[PDB]
Symmetry: C7
């Protein structure tokens, strides 16, 4: 029953390792069953599925997809706050928060990075599209190149809604 | 006394290792004795008895069978929710929830069947007799669950078959897909 | 003070290792002292004193005997429920529950197994026959015969032999 | 712990060095909690040997300390033998309040420097209401009792059923 | 739920290792959600990202920056107290406390030490500037040389506000 | 905050290892600050600084001395009860309880040891520390047993063992406990 | 939230290792925030930064200095009690308690043993013992041991407890 949980806070402070998806989902389910429409605050500082240029989760995509799915299943709105970084699947995750409720701090940085590969790669494009309110085509183009955003850049691209200053 | 339990939630987030069956059953028995007809919510994201192409439970079938049997024994209805995946014995498990109460999310994936029944050169051999008995009980469970004849099921199991949510709903492994 | 205990449930999910008898007895004593006449629910899925063909308890018989003795000493009735298996001493244990209160699920399986260091070793093999007899309401002779061969039961078989009373369904 | 709350002490193991400390601490605690309320000491133990190996070199002196405290406190101690009381465990079982020493049907019992060997004879004697001589004789040979045998020898008072 | 936390105290007694930023942030978030405008007391004795002349955090700068950002995000005022030392990123941290509420003891000591490395080095200059009320130029000049302060020196430079006594 | 502590009981069941002095003192301080004049019950069954004939504390003397000092500092009276044994420093400790309140059971045994200091491998002029130490221990036993420093230093030349009654006559103990 | 802490007691029973300073300070801060002007009791038995002739803290001086600084910062008075020994930085620490409230037991022993730092330590001892910086720097040239009474005359301590 940890502390932050009591405040309806979930803080992802690490790369998303295999066991992380399990934890985040358990916490969402728990919070949802505790109070039905109370908001949940998901704080994110993460490099996604890579750490020091090494892939630390081979399931990263499918894992993040599970999270967003649950995020969409529950009645409680999830707000997101990017503290340091949201890269790769962390960025996908950050942008899946309730529209209008996706936040970042001033200095935050963002990045976007056999019918299994196919079905999966399609679902992620589809998620980013709905999130950023763009066509599937323009997104699949953006993904061809590694693209980094700063807070303001991210707000224009519609990954984020507001910047929290002072 | 964990959290999720207080809410009558059981969340299977891993492959089903030997110790997992014991946990799930303990939790079902506990919940049943706590409140007699209150529903129980079983959330499932699992690859069954395999992890990274390695069998992590040699008892997987008989284990899952034990769970379903208790699920059928208790008075509390068990609802099931597939969150990422239910493969192999996890699929059998997901589909054993109360009919009309078996759920999945949009992107969930399902898969049938099995395994290696692997018999090491330690050995009994009454053994392997229980495997005929066992392979029959699982067909029988899937049949009752999906409302199909034992024959058509034994055919479906000859080939590894993957479902998406909608596919799984037509095959009658699942009842509803959850949205907001 | 675990959970299931709070509900008067004892769940034996393993082979019966040396430390298991101690646990089950402590729990029985505890529950008895907590509420005198309230029933106790003993759930059993176990292969007894063997695991993967290896004997994991050299004391298994005497140990189970101690359990049943306490089971008979306390005022609280003990109900038994077999969930996967009761083999060997686990079967002896399952059948020692209150008559009419010994339960099994549909797919459960049961099995019964075969100086002064003699005059009392003999003493043990006799007590076990005597227990099965009282449990299954059969004569000491018929039982000692049944024990000459490894005999497996399914639920219904076990009910006829009077190891069990009822089979549970919804 | 649990069992303590009920004034139960359960010795389920051989008596290792650290066991004497525990039993005494629990007796003291229970005595200070409620002065004349009974204490229930359940015993299933092989004493100072485990799988034919001596696991306590202090076993005798240790058990003696226990009985001494048992005699010091005002709370009566009842004893219940559940599987076995062998060696020092038997000495221990028999030191419970007379009329309050119990055993189950299938329980088994066994009896196994100069100043010390004398105190142990003296304890068994007082317990079983026998002369120091007849006891020192009984100790020359390893002697095993069943419940009924133990009741006649006056190590135990009653056998529990119901 | 530790002790000092109950008193709204956060005590950084070590170099700032990778896991330290996570802890400090978690604690700020927690305290903020517990009582909105109640002050938070951040005690600092630290050598920053170096320990025995070895860098113990390769992320030290970006990490401290995350901290100050949250410090600026939350409504609760953070007071700072330097107890032995604030060096490097610890000094940057100490000085980011609410103006007028930045404290030190008598014998305390202070020290200041592509699109990425450049962007970062700029944000750190920008933070010190705002903190010490000086122009970006004069700060970048001070940073060319390792400069040590004692309490009084630090108060004049406007890293600190008051020196504590009895 | 363990159990026995709640009852103002301190039970030394072992040889006195280095960490034991710290525990006993902590407990005395705690009990003293909890209730100012309420008695404290110190139960002792111990072989002192030796176990199996091996010295398990090189600081044993100075350690026990620290305890007795605190025992004399606090306002709460300390009663002592010897259960099995008090040997060496444990005997010194048992006898330091409040006069009239030092107890033993019938079968308890006591011993005083030709006290000693132990030397390392590897400083210097700790002579002031050792001669000084052997003297403080004689001084404590004397005050406790109401005897002159001379007669005590003699008794210490030979290992002497007492039974309960012997210990009561020597004035190490006050009373023997019975039913 | 340990026990002694509940009674506003801090007990330093060891050499002062690197992690010790952190603990003592945390405890002071905690006690200060708990009750503002209630006294704090710091019991000291310690050899300072050396153990068995080996330096166990390379930061010992600066560490103790931090402690005394906090001791002077907080409103709660700190009393000190030397049980066995205060050597080196432990002695500096013992003497920093509130004047009139620095205590020792009968048998306690005391001992006193980069440019900026060595100066601050002289300055602290001076204020504590009410002596001039010069006479102190002289005393430090030689290792000097005190007994309780000696320490009271030198004004490291106020009273001896009996």
């Amino acid at each position: 029953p940890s502390l932050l949980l009591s405040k309806r806070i979930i803080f992802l402070s690490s790369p998303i390792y295999p066991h992380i998806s399990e934890q985040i989902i358990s916490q969402l389910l728990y919070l949802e069953y505790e109070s039905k429409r109370k908001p949940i605050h998901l704080y994110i500082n993460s490099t996604g599925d890579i750490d020091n240029n090494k892939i630390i989760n081979l399931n990263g995509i499918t894992d993040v997809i599970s999270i967003v799915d649950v995020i969409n299943y529950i009645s409680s709105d999830v707000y997101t706050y990017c503290l340091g970084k949201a890269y790769g699947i962390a960025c996908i995750l950050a942008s899946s928060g309730k529209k209008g409720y996706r936040f970042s701090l001033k200095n935050s940085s963002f990045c976007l990075n056999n019918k299994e590969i196919m079905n999966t790669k399609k679902k992620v494009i589809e998620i980013i599209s709905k999130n950023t309110e763009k066509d599937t085509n323009v997104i699949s183009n953006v993904l061809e190149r590694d693209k980094y955003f700063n807070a303001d850049e991210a707000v224009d691209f519609k990954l984020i809604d507001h910047i929290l200053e002072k």
